[PDB]
Structure formats: structure tokens, C-alpha cells
Amino acid sequence: TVVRDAVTIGKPAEQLYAVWRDLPGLPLLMTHLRSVEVLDDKRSRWTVEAPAPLGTVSWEAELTADEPGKRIAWRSLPGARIENSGEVLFRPAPGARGTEVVVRLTYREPSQQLRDDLMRFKREQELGL
Amino acid sequence: ETVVRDAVTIGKPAEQLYAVWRDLPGLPLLMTHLRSVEVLDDKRSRWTVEAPAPLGTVSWEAELTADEPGKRIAWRSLPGARIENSGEVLFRPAPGARGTEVVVRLTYRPPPSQQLRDDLMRFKREQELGL
């Protein structure tokens, strides 16, 4: 399955990038996540809630791409429970001075939850949290 | 007349939760219907919300009517305010065991409850996870 959404924010791309690059904070931006822990420069352990008896489901993932102010991408490692990937892009918006943040997640309603998450993110940034 | 009340139990100490709410300028993160909250002095503050296209932004001055560390915070618009409103957040011991039950009551009267519920649930998740 694929989840894709985008929001334009009146802030520099470098500033929005830094927010996402802090992996432990991702569960704030993508609320379907319970926690993200840095294991090393490229690896991290991701966790999400899961009904009984599972409780939670965890897996490890690595960054496949990381370009300051431009993009951050990741994908679960071979053997991870839930096979998934994601990519966040920071692109100059056509209108005026703003950054379009494009988020695409894959795993093999979510769209509504991601929309809400991104709009919330937009709002906080544009008001100054 | 628009009254709203909700409560959520959170597995954290009262003082800590009270601490977040007491930071007035950060209230817009807790109560999403608010655009901004500005401190004017120990007891007064300026509140602002997003008004429909006809208008654009409506603000008024308010004052804290009660501030009991780790227990309660109450506020109310001053007379003449474009929008009459009051609020009260209590931090009570949760019956079950441990944890604090945050109770929020808001009243507004221009010249809702689902949004508050969502805001409170996110506040619960955020606090209980530590992010």
C-alpha cells in the first residue's frame, strides 16, 4: 500500500528538513508511529502500537537517502516484520517563498491520518509553535 | 452560548502536566482553536483566534482568575472583549491509581467538543511517550 500527501509551508527548506532528520521526534509528525530510536548513523529501530496479544510491533530500518534541505528516505531491512519505506521531500513551492513538503510511505484511514499530521505540522510551523 | 467539557486521565504527575498548560504562549498547541496567546503581565494576556474570511482574526484581553500550582488554572475574558469566553483546567488524582485526570471546561459566546477531545488525546499520547 502507498500513502502520499503534501503541504506547503512558509518556512525555509533547511528548517523543515532539520525537524524531520531528528528521527526520535518522527512519531510527532507521523502519529501512526509509537517510537523511533537511533541505533547508529544509518540504522534505527521503529515501533508502532499493535492490538493484543502483540502489544507493539518493532523493526529496524536504514536511511537510503539523506540530503540536507532536500530529502530523507528510509526502508526497513530485509526480514523486518512489516515491510515498509518512506521518503520526505522539501521542494520549492511555485507560489511564493515557501517549501512544499511531500511525504510518501509504503507498506506491504492512513491517508486521513497523514493529512491531519501534515496540516498540524504546517500550522505549528507557520504560527511559530 | 457554547460550553465544552472533557477529561482525560494521564499516567504522569500533576505538577508536570500543570507545567505545560501554565505556559500560556504554548496553549495554541494544546487548544488548536486558538491562534495565539500573549502574556501582558502576571495576570493578563491577549488571546487571538482565526476569524472567517469576512473578518480574519479576532483578539481580546483575558486574565487568570485562578492559578494553583499543579491543581488548577482558570481564565476569563475582560469586559468589552470581542468574544466572551472563560476556561478552567483541573489536575485531579485519578481514581484508579496513579496518574492525573486533566479536566478542561471552555465557554465561548461570539457576538467544538470533538476538536477538544482530539487535542486532549494527543496531549495524553505525547506526554505518556515523552516526545
Side-chain angles (χ1 to χ4, degrees), chain B residues 24-86:
Chain B
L24 306 186
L27 282 173
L29 293 163
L30 298 177
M31 312 194 118
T32 59
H33 54 296
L34 298 179
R35 178 193 177 72
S36 67
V37 180
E38 190 205 331
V39 178
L40 299 183
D41 62 53
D42 296 335
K43 180 161 294 299
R44 298 179 303 133
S45 46
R46 179 130 304 167
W47 295 50
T48 309
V49 291
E50 281 293 294
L55 308 182
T57 346
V58 177
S59 76
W60 65 88
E61 197 177 316
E63 83 183 328
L64 292 170
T65 305
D67 177 28
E68 288 160 44
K71 282 186 171 69
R72 61 141 61 185
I73 306 179
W75 65 90
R76 69 189 176 197
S77 49
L78 268 65
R82 294 188 180 77
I83 303 302
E84 293 159 54
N85 74 287
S86 64

Side-chain angles (χ1 to χ4, degrees), chain A residues 27-28 31 33-34 120 123, chain B residues 28 32 34 122 125 129 131:
Chain A
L28 263 178
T31 62
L33 287 177
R34 175 181 175 72
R120 196 176 307 124
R123 171 173 178 282
Chain B
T32 59
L34 298 179
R122 289 192 287 91
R125 171 180 175 276
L129 291 176
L131 53 64

